[PDB]
Amino acid sequence: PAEILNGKEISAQIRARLKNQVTQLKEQVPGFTPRLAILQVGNRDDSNLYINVKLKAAEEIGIKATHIKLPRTTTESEVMKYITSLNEDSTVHGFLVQLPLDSENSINTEEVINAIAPEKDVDGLTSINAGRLARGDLNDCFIPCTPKGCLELIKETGVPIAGRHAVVVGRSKIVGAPMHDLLLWNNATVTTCHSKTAHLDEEVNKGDILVVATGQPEMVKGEWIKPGAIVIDCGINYVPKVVGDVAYDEAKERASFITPVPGGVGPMTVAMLMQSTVESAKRFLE
Amino acid sequence: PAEILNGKEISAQIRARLKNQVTQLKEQVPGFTPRLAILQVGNRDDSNLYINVKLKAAEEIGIKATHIKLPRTTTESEVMKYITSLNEDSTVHGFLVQLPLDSENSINTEEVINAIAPEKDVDGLTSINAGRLARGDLNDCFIPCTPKGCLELIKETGVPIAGRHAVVVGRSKIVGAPMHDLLLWNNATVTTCHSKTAHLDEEVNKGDILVVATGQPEMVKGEWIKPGAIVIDCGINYVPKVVGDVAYDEAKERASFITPVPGGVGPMTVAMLMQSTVESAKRFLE
Amino acid sequence: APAEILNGKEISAQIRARLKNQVTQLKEQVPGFTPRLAILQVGNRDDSNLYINVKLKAAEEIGIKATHIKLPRTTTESEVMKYITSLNEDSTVHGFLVQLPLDSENSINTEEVINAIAPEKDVDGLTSINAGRLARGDLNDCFIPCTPKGCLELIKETGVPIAGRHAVVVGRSKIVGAPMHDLLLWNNATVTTCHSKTAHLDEEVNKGDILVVATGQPEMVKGEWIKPGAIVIDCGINYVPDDKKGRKVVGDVAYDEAKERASFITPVPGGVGPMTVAMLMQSTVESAKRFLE
Amino acid sequence: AEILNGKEISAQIRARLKNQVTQLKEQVPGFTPRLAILQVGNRDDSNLYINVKLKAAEEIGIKATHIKLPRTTTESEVMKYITSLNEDSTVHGFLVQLPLDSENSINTEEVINAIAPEKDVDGLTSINAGRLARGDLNDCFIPCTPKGCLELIKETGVPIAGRHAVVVGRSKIVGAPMHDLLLWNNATVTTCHSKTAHLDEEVNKGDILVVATGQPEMVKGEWIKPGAIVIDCGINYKVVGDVAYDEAKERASFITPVPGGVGPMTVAMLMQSTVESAKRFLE
Ligand SMILES: NC(=O)c1ccc[n+]([C@@H]2O[C@H](COP(=O)([O-])OP(=O)(O)OC[C@H]3O[C@@H](n4cnc5c(N)ncnc54)[C@H](OP(=O)(O)O)[C@@H]3O)[C@@H](O)[C@H]2O)c1
Ligand SMILES: NC(=O)c1ccc[n+]([C@@H]2O[C@H](COP(=O)([O-])OP(=O)(O)OC[C@H]3O[C@@H](n4cnc5c(N)ncnc54)[C@H](OP(=O)(O)O)[C@@H]3O)[C@@H](O)[C@H]2O)c1
Ligand SMILES: NC(=O)c1ccc[n+]([C@@H]2O[C@H](COP(=O)([O-])OP(=O)(O)OC[C@H]3O[C@@H](n4cnc5c(N)ncnc54)[C@H](OP(=O)(O)O)[C@@H]3O)[C@@H](O)[C@H]2O)c1
């Protein structure tokens, strides 16, 4: 059976390294501290949970994180005002808008996201940062935090990515599409699948590397997995318990390496956000 | 044998149609013309040819196209003076920098391209337009002209794209990477290959749709082709004669539809540029 | 448990020291004489710039005059052919090579260019003449490609006789894999050659008492495949993206597992790489000595 | 075990070549393919083989001249004849029958490598060998015995790519070019020779097996892999091959008899290359 990729343990190493890094910055530049802001619209329970998890990690590391929660009935004009203020506040080094917005009024998510200054866009969701990533200009952009965490998990196997066939199932702005770009510029041959893909099972079977981000619980069957594959399950699905987008039991029999759910991608996503935040803070000093 | 996709004929139809739009807009808004500018650094032979073809097309349609040719000794800051000037000239509706820059100095191509105002970026090469396309926001952006042209050639076959498996060989900023995005958001399942892909022949054979943009003369062999494939060949190679990146003679015995070289993608690239220029002229009027 | 390391960095240094002393003696025995190598480059590929510079530095340390001729990517075939003719006829140039691949805007027939090199100056062993002599076992009338030369020296460093053993070569390229097969064969190994159309590569690899890998596919050859006790020679130099560095160099062999199965193994970097350069200097010195005779 | 009948197969190649030579003569009147065979000494085996080749050329319509130099020929005298055959625009291909039988010490390598590669229809020059051994198969002459062996293997209809082939013998004229030829048809190839340990086990790996050792019936049928394609190049004097034919026939799926197997194919491939050098000259 597969080696388990323990996201809980790996993310802990990353947070301790960031913690010590932040401590050293404070020693070298007294009074300085990385500052994150999280903006939310509405009151979705899962958004509440994930934001709380992010605040706890910021606090462990010594990043000052402020959470601003606007009600369901806010207007796009109201959110734009807050984004402008965060852009202009020079003590805020990065900030993000937790998605999806949960609003009674139609609010243009792409307009809201794209008002974020690219230098503070630690979620890497602006068009500017996406376009840098999608075209291989990887050193001047924030990369979205879940693809970053997935990449670090793949690298924990010690198997080089270059030349491997990687399959990404899902193409969302937040996970699937940036994952494809990250694997491409790590020199994998990449196939991207979606809801219009036919013969998904045969596409999945091509992947030496498989990243699944669909939101469909255990829809990717273990019998489809290429023997020896590295399997990265981004799913967090609540069912009659938490399960991933991959059928874990059968997949684990065939994979060389696999992420458990929970304790896999989830903690790595949060740790990567903290890493990007520390990076913007260091960039701000210089 | 495959039906020939005749880009030379298809483009003529597009250009004749564009001329009618331009004539119609000239009488509906008197004294108004679409205005294009093409900036060149250095004196490459192929760049000279391609710029000349674009000027020819713009002349036939009624677009006022200017060609600024800077010497090989141009600095990055001299280039930025022209880009800044073109952004600010309200009479210029779109402009592009022919690539690659041929300068004996070192010029950050990315810094130059990304100084172009996005609403004049008729080549779709800025990060902003690339990020929109790469995230599926296809109604807000300029799409690179060679991908635009390849999509039109594919539609001319009448075979729907949704659910087919598309293989793109090459990932360049100008062609291969935007070709992947355009096919993906037309709901193909897409594999991208490059110089590090292993078993390229096996990977090419999965493509119901095959777009080759490698700059390697006749490198993709006909034996590799999936029987019945739609074969789109972007290569323009001068060999001991002009050949594409696909071995055309034997690929024709396998494809259901194939683009010749010359007379395939090339003229479509130019027509699609004139289309985007007219689109930004109409956009400017509102 | 772990395999002994074939330290190409140390071994190549012993070779260059030896060549240094014997070029210092040649410059005394025949005053005013300097062994001279030319490197012809078309284009400006970044990896080619590094390997050329690494070769020039080795030449300079030993006392070889090495001339880098870099033609722009606009160069035509007939223009390259004029340079090669010029180096063929320049009697102060004892060896020269064309760094491959050529990086030109124009298509240049690489075989035409390479085979125009005079075989007695073909210190890279790339002409069809030198390849034909090697491939038919006529080893003392030819220049052997530098990477296979370095690999053979690394193999002999083990102290393990080659005759009788089963050798597996993964890769059949003109520069490395095919001349490697010939060199092992005429050293009396039984030799199996693998490539991209080999089925059960893992089983074929498992046959190799001697294993030479030259595929350019990073760590594709799994350690689990390695025959226990094998001598493992890794020719791979693969630059894999690495945002913690911005890349790193890895071999064609998964070293961390392979070294628990092999008796001897080359690390990457520091293995075949420096030996390749040391062998070029050795062949260059040999061609200068042959010029005097 | 099916029988690869070189005598029948070669007859078809010679008939195909014959008509091909007839059509060529009708298209360019007064033009015929011309071969020259040079011999040093008077070995009986070479007299026989050269005669068999001359006869094949006559059946097809190739004009072949045989020049036989004495045992006391010098290297210099042989070189004069090669220079003349190179410079004779009438001659499209020529070969030197090997081994040279000379009282004097003559460098065979030197003699062979003075042949112009465009006329080297035996493929024995270092130039043609280096093209073949590096996979540039499109512009060289492949030695005739390996050419014929490959034709025999293809006659089975079993594809070569991905099969494991074993070659026993590494000689300049058969074994070494035979390895190259199978390799660039994408077999995985093992070469064995007189220093190969456990030759029995090695031979057992071959889906394709070519034996070119000159050791009468040394390869035992018990060694053959069941279903193997067995190609026997041996001509050992009764005449028998290098494979124990009776036992090997109970294991192989296809097998060459000796005589009537490779032997006829070798001669037909030389004629094929001669006709081919005549076409290249016509342009
Ligand atoms: N920290 C973390 O672990 C983390 C972070 C973010 C998200 N996630 C999780 O990842 C999962 C997906 O998230 P998302 O943001 O990517 O959501 P999303 O916007 O709903 O995207 C779903 C994607 O999956 C595709 N898909 C749906 N059904 C499919 C099917 N039957 N076959 C193939 N593709 C199919 C959709 O295809 P179309 O494009 O054709 O609709 C779409 O591209 C969820 O469980 C989410 O919580 C986890
Ligand atoms: N109107 C038109 O028809 C039109 C318009 C624009 C361009 N083009 C043509 O499209 C072609 C593009 O090539 P270029 O060199 O000019 O651009 P380039 O920017 O050098 O891109 C070459 C792409 O092909 C890949 N590639 C190179 N060798 C390969 C191989 N052996 N196997 C697989 N992939 C390989 C490269 O991979 P890496 O990324 O790994 O290096 C890269 O992604 C040219 O012929 C160009 O003229 C045509
Ligand atoms: N000093 C040194 O260390 C040194 C010097 C020179 C070169 N090199 C290195 O040697 C490596 C290869 O270079 P090269 O010129 O030999 O490369 P190449 O021309 O790209 O050839 C690679 C060979 O490997 C084979 N191959 C590819 N994938 C395979 C697979 N999955 N299974 C089996 N065989 C496979 C190919 O098979 P096909 O033949 O069927 O295509 C081909 O023969 C590179 O890392 C290069 O930098 C190192």
Ligand SMILES: NC(=O)c1ccc[n+]([C@@H]2O[C@H](COP(=O)([O-])OP(=O)(O)OC[C@H]3O[C@@H](n4cnc5c(N)ncnc54)[C@H](OP(=O)(O)O)[C@@H]3O)[C@@H](O)[C@H]2O)c1
């Ligand atoms: N027209 C035809 O059909 C035709 C044409 C030419 C030749 N032939 C025949 O083919 C046979 C071989 O000819 P050749 O020119 O190749 O002869 P050769 O030059 O004597 O070569 C014999 C090869 O077999 C190897 N060998 C000898 N004993 C061996 C053993 N016990 N185990 C393994 N390998 C062994 C030798 O190995 P070493 O290299 O280690 O000595 C050598 O490589 C002869 O019978 C010859 O007449 C037939």
Ligand SMILES: Nc1nc(N)c(NC(=O)Nc2ccc(C(=O)N[C@@H](CCC(=O)O)C(=O)O)cc2Cl)c(=O)[nH]1
């Ligand atoms: N702007 C914006 N909008 C978004 N929707 C996202 N997505 C997002 O935050 N996802 C997300 C983040 C963290 C977890 C998580 O915490 N998982 C752990 C359990 C707790 C632990 O970490 O200890 C586990 O599974 O083990 C799970 C998820 Cl789905 C974003 O990133 N940016």
Ligand SMILES: Nc1nc(N)c(NC(=O)Nc2ccc(C(=O)N[C@@H](CCC(=O)O)C(=O)O)cc2Cl)c(=O)[nH]1
């Ligand atoms: N900024 C920027 N930089 C770039 N380098 C490009 N690329 C580009 O212009 N390519 C390009 C454009 C046209 C042709 C062509 O005209 N081909 C015709 C022959 C003439 C005809 O009849 O039209 C044919 O093949 O038949 C061929 C090519 Cl390669 C770009 O688009 N933007």
Ligand SMILES: Nc1nc(N)c(NC(=O)Nc2ccc(C(=O)N[C@@H](CCC(=O)O)C(=O)O)cc2Cl)c(=O)[nH]1
């Ligand atoms: N004509 C022609 N064309 C070619 N492309 C080649 N190949 C070639 O030069 N390869 C090559 C050479 C040297 C290195 C290297 O620097 N290796 C060392 C580090 C420093 C050291 O050399 O000491 C290490 O890995 O530790 C790496 C490589 Cl890939 C050729 O030989 N002839």
Ligand SMILES: Nc1nc(N)c(NC(=O)Nc2ccc(C(=O)N[C@@H](CCC(=O)O)C(=O)O)cc2Cl)c(=O)[nH]1
């Ligand atoms: N330059 C050079 N030198 C060389 N020594 C060779 N070798 C060579 O000719 N060998 C050779 C050739 C033909 C036969 C033969 O006659 N075989 C048939 C019988 C009748 C028929 O040929 O049809 C059979 O056995 O059935 C047998 C052999 Cl050993 C060469 O090729 N080139």
